[PDB]
């Protein structure tokens, strides 16, 4: 029933999934002279080398590009992290104009989009397992703003005609996540959770301060896609992010 329109969207979701208003939730604003930098985090251990892309798929709510997770083949580990995370997924959030469309902000400024790679716990056994715990998921967030083009995100651009409502899967194998990041590894983390319903208080969140840059074309793309099925009104999928929500009793730490 969930989702980012007037009658249904995030000031909602407290209706059916009361955590929305919970003591973890995400996104949260960045203030950048608030977070502490905090010498003992580790450096941020990001190996996709061997990373193992199957498919994109269109929810009705964003695009995931999903990877086979039954090895460990693409993961994250260091920085605030104990243990090993792997990568299941990756997708983002993004606006009907540059102005507006990224979750997390940085002392209040609001990117054009965001990109969102999951990744859960392996001492969980599996994704589903591992939602249910407080440290069960990893999300690497990394802002996008529009500049110049971003050639590895072109493939993704390139496949959205095909998985345009929802519903729509399409093959999208060998796909390279390491192209999607930008040249530092410095990041913010702070404890939180999943933006979308369930809004599970699951995740570390670690949030890169570098953001990438993509061109106004490739965005464009992103806004030609649709919340509704195939046969339903069109409804352009545009401003799936979140506004962000109380910090409450947290603190970011920065790894710079
Ligand atoms: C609800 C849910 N379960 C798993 C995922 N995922 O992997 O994207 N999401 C979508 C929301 O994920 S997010 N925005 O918190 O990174
Ligand atoms: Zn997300």
């Not at 404890?191 to 840059?213: A, D, H, Q, Y």
């Not at 979140?242 to 947290?250: E, W, Y």
């Amino acid at each position: 029933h969930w989702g980012y329109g007037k009658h249904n969207g995030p000031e909602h979701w407290h209706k059916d999934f009361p955590i929305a208003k919970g003591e973890r939730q995400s996104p949260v604003d960045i203030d950048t002279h608030t977070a502490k930098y905090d010498p003992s985090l580790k450096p941020l251990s990001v190996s996709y080398d061997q990373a193992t892309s199957l498919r994109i798929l269109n929810n009705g709510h964003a695009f995931n590009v999903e990877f086979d997770d039954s090895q460990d083949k693409a993961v994250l580990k260091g920085g605030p992290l104990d243990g090993t995370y792997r990568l299941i997924q990756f997708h983002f959030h993004w606006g009907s104009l540059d102005g507006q469309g990224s979750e997390h902000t940085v002392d209040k400024k609001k990117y054009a989009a965001e990109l969102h790679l999951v990744h859960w716990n392996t001492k969980y056994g599996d994704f589903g397992k591992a939602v249910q715990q407080p440290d069960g998921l990893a999300v690497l967030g990394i802002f996008l703003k529009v500049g110049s083009a971003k050639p590895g995100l072109q493939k993704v651009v390139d496949v959205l005609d095909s998985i345009k409502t929802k519903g729509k899967s399409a093959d999208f194998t060998n796909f390279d996540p390491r192209g999607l990041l930008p040249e530092s590894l410095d990041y913010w983390t702070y404890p939180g959770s999943l933006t979308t319903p369930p809004l599970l208080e699951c995740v570390t969140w670690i949030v890169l301060k570098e953001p990438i840059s993509v061109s106004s074309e490739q965005v464009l793309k992103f806004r030609k896609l649709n919340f509704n099925g195939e046969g339903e009104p069109e409804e352009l999928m545009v401003d799936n992010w979140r506004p962000a929500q109380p910090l409450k009793n947290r603190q970011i730490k920065a790894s710079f």
